[PDB]
Amino acid sequence: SITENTSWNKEFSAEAVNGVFVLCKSSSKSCATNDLARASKEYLPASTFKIPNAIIGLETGVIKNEHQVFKWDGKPRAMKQWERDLTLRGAIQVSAVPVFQQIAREVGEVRMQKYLKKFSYGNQNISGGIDKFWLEGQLRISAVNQVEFLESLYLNKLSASKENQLIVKEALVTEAAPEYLVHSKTGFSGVGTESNPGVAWWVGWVEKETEVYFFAFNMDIDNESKLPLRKSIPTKIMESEGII
Amino acid sequence: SITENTSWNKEFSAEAVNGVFVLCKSSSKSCATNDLARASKEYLPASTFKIPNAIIGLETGVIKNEHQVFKWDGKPRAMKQWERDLTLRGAIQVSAVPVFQQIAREVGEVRMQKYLKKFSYGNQNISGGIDKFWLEGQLRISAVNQVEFLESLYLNKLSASKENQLIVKEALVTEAAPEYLVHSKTGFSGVGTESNPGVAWWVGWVEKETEVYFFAFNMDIDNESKLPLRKSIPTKIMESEGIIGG
Numbered sequence: 001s002i003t004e005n006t007s008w009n010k011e012f013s014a015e016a017v018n019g020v021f022v023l024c025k026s027s028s029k030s031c032a033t034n035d036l037a038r039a040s041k042e043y044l045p046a047s048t049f050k051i052p053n054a055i056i057g058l059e060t061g062v063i064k065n066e067h068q069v070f071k072w073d074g075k076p077r078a079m080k081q082w083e084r085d086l087t088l089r090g091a092i093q094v095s096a097v098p099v100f101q102q103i104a105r106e107v108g109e110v111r112m113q114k115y116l117k118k119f120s121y122g123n124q125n126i127s128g129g130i131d132k133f134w135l136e137g138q139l140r141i142s143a144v145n146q147v148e149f150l151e152s153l154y155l156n157k158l159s160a161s162k163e164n165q166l167i168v169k170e171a172l173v174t175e176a177a178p179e180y181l182v183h184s185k186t187g188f189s190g191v192g193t194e195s196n197p198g199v200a201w202w203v204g205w206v207e208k209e210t211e212v213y214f215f216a217f218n219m220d221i222d223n224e225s226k227l228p229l230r231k232s233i234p235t236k237i238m239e240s241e242g243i244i
Numbered sequence: 245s246i247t248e249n250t251s252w253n254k255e256f257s258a259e260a261v262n263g264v265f266v267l268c269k270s271s272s273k274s275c276a277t278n279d280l281a282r283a284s285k286e287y288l289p290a291s292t293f294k295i296p297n298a299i300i301g302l303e304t305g306v307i308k309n310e311h312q313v314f315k316w317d318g319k320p321r322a323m324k325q326w327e328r329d330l331t332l333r334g335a336i337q338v339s340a341v342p343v344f345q346q347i348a349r350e351v352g353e354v355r356m357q358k359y360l361k362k363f364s365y366g367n368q369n370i371s372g373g374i375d376k377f378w379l380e381g382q383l384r385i386s387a388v389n390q391v392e393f394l395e396s397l398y399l400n401k402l403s404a405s406k407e408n409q410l411i412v413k414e415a416l417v418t419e420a421a422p423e424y425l426v427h428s429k430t431g432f433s434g435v436g437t438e439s440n441p442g443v444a445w446w447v448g449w450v451e452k453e454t455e456v457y458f459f460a461f462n463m464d465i466d467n468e469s470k471l472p473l474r475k476s477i478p479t480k481i482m483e484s485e486g487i488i489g490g
């Protein structure tokens with residue numbers, strides 16, 4: 001079903017980046033990628049895990065409803081941008097790791113395992129601690145699997161209420177225009193080492209007029225200055241494809 | 245209770261327009277307006293009616309689901325942007341009048357009347373033709389009632405499924421940033437004369453950090469060139485209030 005577009009490599013070789021972009025028009029049955037081998041290779045999801053984690057938090061009642069406020073206790077957090085009260089959309093958009101570590105703790109291992117099985121989420125390996133498995137643990141997911149998962153969310157076909165899927169979808173909106181709407185989420189596991197790099201992601205979908213395009217990007221990253229390429233490489237490819 | 249902030253009148257007089265802005269922080273119990281008399285005055289909703297019309301279309305099954313495509317029959321429409329197949333969000337955002345005239349026809353008078361009673365939607369007067377009552381008919385709604393209605397939608401408290409309310413809410417998103425989100429809808433009944441003006445609206449809500457602001461603006465419009473003031477006057481007021489900007 002998946003085809004290779006070697007012209008998309010221009011955008012990767014120019015920045016000396018080892019990565020993959022998977023782009024699907026209408027459904028995950030019609031996908032194209034720059035690298036067929038890397039398209040199914042599995043990596044730590046990092047903050048892209050906030051999408052299933054938010055759905056699970058709502059499903060289990062850990063997150064009361066769409067208007068739940070996650071209060072800051074005034075005690076130090078890793079990022080200044082996290083040192084404030086956040087809505088569910090705010091906590092997803094600023095990628096507030098401690099908010100989601102607390103949700104994962106409240107969900108617990110049994111319920112987390114059950115939902116990742118329901119969602120067919122990567123290797124479904126939640127070893128490495130309940131509040132760390134997606135950051136430094138054993139959980140791995142491919143770009144192809146991210147697209148399949150996002151397509152299910154878009155269609156309200158995940159094993160969750162349509163209401164909870166709709167709440168998480170509005171939380172994912174990053175661009176809005178009269179005939180163009182983007183839902184997306186970034187991820188970054190850190191810079192690792194040279195030989196064992198970290199991973200950076202950008203996943204989501206574009207609704208342009210009456211068409212839908214699902215996408216998932218990942219790349220090896222050992223230098224934090226390369227981080228914006230997680231959005232600029234996929235954007236340049238979608239621009240060359242006329243999606244914009 | 246609703247309070248008057250007459251210091252906002254300079255934003256209207258600067259442009260020689262007659263209008264009202266209603267702004268509520270957290271809930272419709274804490275509102276402020278430049279003009280208490282006009283805040284309760286009822287006007288044709290024009291395209292702001294696409295919000296209840298879309299909810300009613302979903303509730304009645306006239307609109308199948310969130311991914312319903314409204315096909316273009318290839319016949320001339322007033323705007324080039326309307327001459328194409330549209331999604332529900334697309335039809336609301338481009339304000340495609342003919343799509344909603346067809347939804348209203350399919351909903352019909354009895355069902356339309358029942359839902360406008362459930363929603364406490366203005367004067368609930370749908371006379372003037374089933375496909376025209378909100379454009380040139382007898383339907384009227386105030387800026388205060390728009391804020392009450394929008395607050396109910398935000399809280400999923402309208403007499404409709406939470407699912408249908410959530411679908412219409414995503415269709416209304418017009419601005420998105422990590423800690424700033426806007427849901428809004430414009431309306432314009434058509435240009436009138438100075439003595440018999442048309443009405444232009446801008447209604448919606450702003451979610452900024454963990455706060456919510458409900459708003460409704462309307463103005464008399466007697467010159468087509470004044471139409472963008474329906475967004476620039478409320479924007480200047482929200483800027484002076486500290487909602488827009490840091």
Ligand SMILES: *[B@@]1([O])O[C]([C]C([O])=O)C2=C1[C]=C(OC1=NC([N])=NS1)C([C])=C2[C]
Binds near residue numbers: 097135189
């Ligand atoms: B996450 O993937 O998104 C943010 C970073 C961003 O670019 O928005 C973020 C994510 C995870 C994360 O926590 C981590 N823990 C480990 N062990 N590796 S990454 C952090 C710190 C941030 C900022």
